[PDB]
Design a protein around this ligand. Structure first.
Ligand SMILES: [Cl-]
Ligand SMILES: [Mg+2]
Ligand SMILES: [Zn+2]
Ligand SMILES: [Zn+2]
Lengths: 118, 41, 117, 516, 259, 116
């Protein structure tokens, strides 16, 4: 079975880099956005994009802290039914906390394994 | 448009009315570019 | 990665005139293969967003998504021998108004959309 | 469009005196009618902005065409300060003009005991002085009420009115549902007892002031039967058509024996105004209690108002017709206009539905109180902010939540509006009032009696001319507002004499105007 | 053909009326309805005043007779179609007693609140035993429309004839309608409330506003006081007829013309 | 030729708030050789038109032309140690006029002089 759908647990260009490498291969994309990231193109350049941080499930979570909150990630990796989380760089990309919820949900972290992070 | 099946539509811009008197409306339609041609009565 | 753009005339504010060749922006795709060139050119073309003027991107993707072209079975006579309704309404009415509302009072600026209980 | 004027209830009062006049009302078979068009009508629909110019001119028609009318409610309420503050015009001159136009009908003012026209609380001698001038000015029928229904706070006013030999109509404010066992605080005994106490206090007539149009027809039947068994005085019923069923209630009341009823000319009736006068008369027509008002004339006059009302387009509200929410929130008709347009001006135009629920809640939190001007205001303010600050009622009364309570709330809870029979809710007030100390006696009774000769001197020196008892009366009620009108008058001459369009809009180009 | 498709489509209760109350002109439809096995509510149009001895063409016998004819013609329900909201509470007390003594059919009462005393008539009607009544949601009630549903329900709450409708839900729906209606700011009339003059002219709720924004279109805007009388006169000149779409219309054109 | 771009976060009328990396584009210039690389990069870096918000293009064009980058003599402490007016006047006079002329004879409504 192949990876048909990609979440970019990131924003900015580097999200936009990945949507492309992925897209040219026929691979579908997925984004994520804060409240203060409601305008970021990558969310629109995604094949689909759900919110993170804000809402009756949270008080809200500070712009970046939301792009970091691993409560949110999974909650959105699932909601789309996506099967490989490409963390990009910076933000969350080298945490085991991010490879333990991805292992709490069963998703595939496009990088090295979880305890290679510690 | 159906019980499916939502169309997300954005009005991006409109143009000055041309000759033949046709206006062009620039929409986004589920994150894709479309343009539509209408006369200006 | 792999795309080049010969730019020059196209920006926000640009004035496009019918005196000259209709060249907005020339695009060139690069790939280590001639079948990724096609998806590297397909991808960029589908990514463009030009508002104000039409373009031939639909025709430009169309030729490179076509069975005769994608594998090299093609000649120089290849080309010679080769919701919307709903956006039409919207467009029409956004430009011209509806006749029943055109010259009568408008709603408050400024008004909450009805929510089903 | 006649001849001289048929004698009316005005002549009748002058001959009988207030007491025997009332027994006349009681003894009359026909229901009696008060038209509220000149006061409550435009108060409720047009923000009390109706001008003397339009109002004086219709006095004589009323006088000739509808001589069977019990009274014209045409003074008091918001009209006293509005005229001056916003219309640049003397309400004493308004009253004089209607008095000379209709020398045959009774002229009626709404008076709020404790405060008269009252933006605040005045020493007794100021309330006394005010009523005296109002009787000089042309008033025959004073409907006096107290925003908490505290009889005690009405004794001064009633005594003044009686002293002046004029009609004292003491009003009981209606709230709740007498037929709803669930809300036992405002039951039938509540009103009947009150009637009896108002009778002992010297009322010539009892009124039922249904300020929010809350009386329902089934209850009108119970209540008015009960009241008339409870006191021998005549009963007068006032209500508003916010539910779009006040006309029923009125008709129910009439069958029930009620002695007089208010209504407004058709062109300014309905919604938060009174029920429609033309249509209540037509429904009664040919019945045993037929009021005998000429419906052709009602129509003619109504049409005149309708025209008059088109001039005041800018003060029209966004309200679109019957609202049974009134039973839920209970906002009075004369305070359903100002409030939701104050809530616009605050950035809360989309959330006036929520507001209503807290204004309901608030009421309960203050302890379920009568809500009529000004208690009503004080209540608006709480929901205004329980929404502006997004607070609930345990949150409003929360030791760990710094609420900056509106002045009006601070004030009422302290004692300035008087006492509801249950008193005030300790904790809210203990927190509300922030160390400042409350009282429980009649606010009137703590006040130093006004040095009239001195106070007169202050104002006379200030205008740099002598003032009239009337003008002086105005100053005691509203010093700042009167001062300004006085000076705006010295600059502009008698602008009251101008036709409404010219007053609000001056003149077009080449346009010509007769001005008297 | 039309009644067939209408029934196929989802209509269950067909209120059928004729603009001059002429039973002969109702049979084809009533037969149709009945053949489709649906409910046939045959409406009698109210007009005049049964308690006004001075206009006797429309007395009480006129209605009760029509009630009986209509039963014979196969009505399942009789409706009183008070299209201009002219029935008055005292007449309701009489009319519904009489009709319920004249036929055993259920009675349905439909009215308009132009006079701004329609709710009164509805409550009298209900007291007299009428079987069903029409009301509009609050947000869309009053004036030339029906009386206020919420307020009528509240008024009957806990009486022997309580319709047991949840007034919380009524409010909830009404708020929604209120929102919807804000959208239609384009089509709002300039009528501000009660007009008792409906009893002089008798123009129906449908068509009292339309006519006033015909009366201005035509430059007599300062005159819908004589138009008022002309309608009343023209009506009588025609022989005093029942005025509801499209009879009403005809009378209007005449009244306009005479002015 | 030889300018890869990885951007797409920026455009005419966009809003850049301050909560994240404020990276506008990533200009990448390649060359046949290391030095034709810099002039290609310095040409792009210059060619650019950005306005509404401030830029490090003039800090970048000061990094790539400095002789220590040109020949590879930098360390990790290279850095740490090294018209409206016209539209205004026009509008100003368009609105109030020139005081030396505003109250005198105007030219006919006129042949612009033409240089022979
Ligand atoms: Cl003041
Ligand atoms: Mg009596
Ligand atoms: Zn009132
Ligand atoms: Zn109807």
């Amino acid at each position: 079975g192949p990876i048909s759908k990609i979440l970019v647990a990131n924003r900015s260009e580097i999200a936009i880099r990945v949507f492309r490498a992925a897209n040219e291969l026929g691979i579908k994309t997925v984004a994520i956005w804060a409240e203060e990231d409601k305008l970021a193109l990558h969310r629109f350049k995604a094949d689909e994009s759900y919110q993170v941080g804000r809402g009756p499930h949270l008080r809200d979570l500070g712009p970046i802290e939301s792009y970091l909150s691993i409560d949110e990630v999974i909650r959105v990796a699932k909601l789309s039914g996506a099967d490989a989380i490409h963390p990009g760089y910076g933000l969350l990309s080298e945490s085991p906390e991010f490879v333990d919820a991805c292992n709490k949900a069963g998703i595939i972290f496009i990088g090295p394994k979880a305890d290679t992070m510690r | 448009i159906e019980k499916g099946k939502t169309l997300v539509i954005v009005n991006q811009a409109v143009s000055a009315t041309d000759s033949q008197g046709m206006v062009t409306v620039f929409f986004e339609l589920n994150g894709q570019p479309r343009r539509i041609k209408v006369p200006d009565r | 990665f792999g795309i080049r753009l010969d730019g020059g005339t196209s920006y926000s504010g640009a004035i496009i005139t019918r005196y000259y060749d209709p060249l907005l922006v020339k695009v060139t795709a690069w790939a280590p293969n001639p079948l990724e060139a096609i998806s590297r050119m397909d991808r960029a073309l589908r990514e463009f967003r030009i508002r104000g003027v039409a373009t031939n991107l639909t025709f430009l993707e169309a030729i490179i998504g076509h069975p005769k072209f994608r594998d090299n079975s093609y000649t120089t006579r290849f080309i010679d021998t080769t919701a919307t309704k709903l956006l039409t309404y919207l467009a029409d009415v956004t430009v011209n108004g509806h006749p029943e509302a055109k010259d009568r009072p408008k709603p408050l600026e400024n008004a909450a959309r009805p929510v089903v209980p | 469009y006649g001849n001289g004027v048929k004698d009316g209830t005005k002549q009748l009062l002058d001959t009988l005196g207030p007491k025997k006049f009332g027994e006349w009302m009681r003894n009359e078979k026909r229901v009696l009618l008060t038209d509220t068009t000149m006061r409550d009508g435009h108060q409720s629909l047009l923000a009390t902005r109706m001008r003397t110019y339009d109002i004086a001119r219709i006095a004589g028609t009323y006088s000739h065409a509808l001589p069977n009318l019990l009274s014209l409610e045409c003074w008091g309420g918001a009209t006293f300060d509005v005229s001056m503050r916003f219309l640049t015009e003397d309400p004493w001159e308004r009253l004089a003009l209607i008095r000379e136009g209709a020398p045959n009908l009774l002229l009626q003012m709404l008076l709020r005991g404790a405060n008269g026209v009252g933006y605040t609380n005045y020493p007794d001698n100021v309330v006394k002085y005010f009523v005296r001038q109002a009787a000089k000015g042309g008033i025959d029928l004073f409907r006096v009420f107290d925003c908490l229904n505290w009889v005690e706070n009405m004794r001064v006013s009633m005594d003044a009115i009686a002293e002046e030999n004029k009609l004292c109509e003491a009003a009981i404010c209606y709230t709740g549902d007498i037929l709803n066992s669930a809300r036992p605080k405002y039951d039938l005994k509540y009103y009947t007892n009150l009637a009896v106490e108002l009778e002992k206090a010297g009322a010539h007539i009892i009124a039922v002031k249904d300020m929010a149009g809350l009386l329902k027809p089934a209850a009108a039947k119970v209540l008015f039967k009960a009241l008339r068994e409870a006191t021998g005085l005549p009963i007068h019923f006032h209500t508003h058509d916010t539910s779009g069923i006040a006309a029923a209630t009125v008709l129910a009341a009439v069958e029930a024996g009620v002695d007089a009823v208010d209504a407004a000319m058709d062109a300014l009736s309905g919604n938060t105004s009174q029920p429609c006068l033309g249509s209540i008369v037509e429904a009664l027509s040919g019945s045993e209690r037929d009021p005998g008002l000429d419906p052709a004339w009602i129509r003619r006059i109504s049409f005149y108002w309708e025209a008059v009302r088109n001039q005041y387009a800018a003060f029209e509200s966004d309200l679109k017709g019957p609202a049974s929410e009134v039973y839920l929130h209970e906002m009075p008709g004369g305070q359903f206009t100002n409030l939701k347009e104050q809530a616009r001006s605050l950035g809360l135009e989309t959330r006036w539905h929520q507001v209503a629920q807290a204004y309901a809640d608030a009421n309960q939190m203050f302890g379920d109180i009568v809500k009529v001007a000004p208690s009503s205001k004080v209540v608006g303010d709480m929901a205004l902010m329980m929404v502006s600050q997004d607070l609930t009622v345990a949150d409003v009364v929360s030791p760990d939540r710094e609420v900056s309570f509106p002045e009006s709330v601070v004030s009422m809870l302290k004692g300035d509006l008087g006492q509801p029979p249950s008193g005030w809710p300790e904790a809210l007030q203990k927190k509300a009032l922030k160390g400042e100390k409350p009282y429980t006696v009649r606010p009137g009774s703590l006040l130093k009696e006004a040095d009239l000769d001195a106070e007169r001197k202050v104002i006379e020196k200030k205008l740099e001319r002598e003032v009239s008892d009337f003008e002086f009366a105005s100053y005691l009620m509203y010093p700042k507002v009167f001062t300004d009108f006085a000076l705006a008058s010295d600059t502009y001459g008698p602008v009251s004499v101008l036709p409404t369009p010219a007053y609000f809009y001056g003149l077009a180009d080449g346009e010509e105007l007769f001005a008297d």
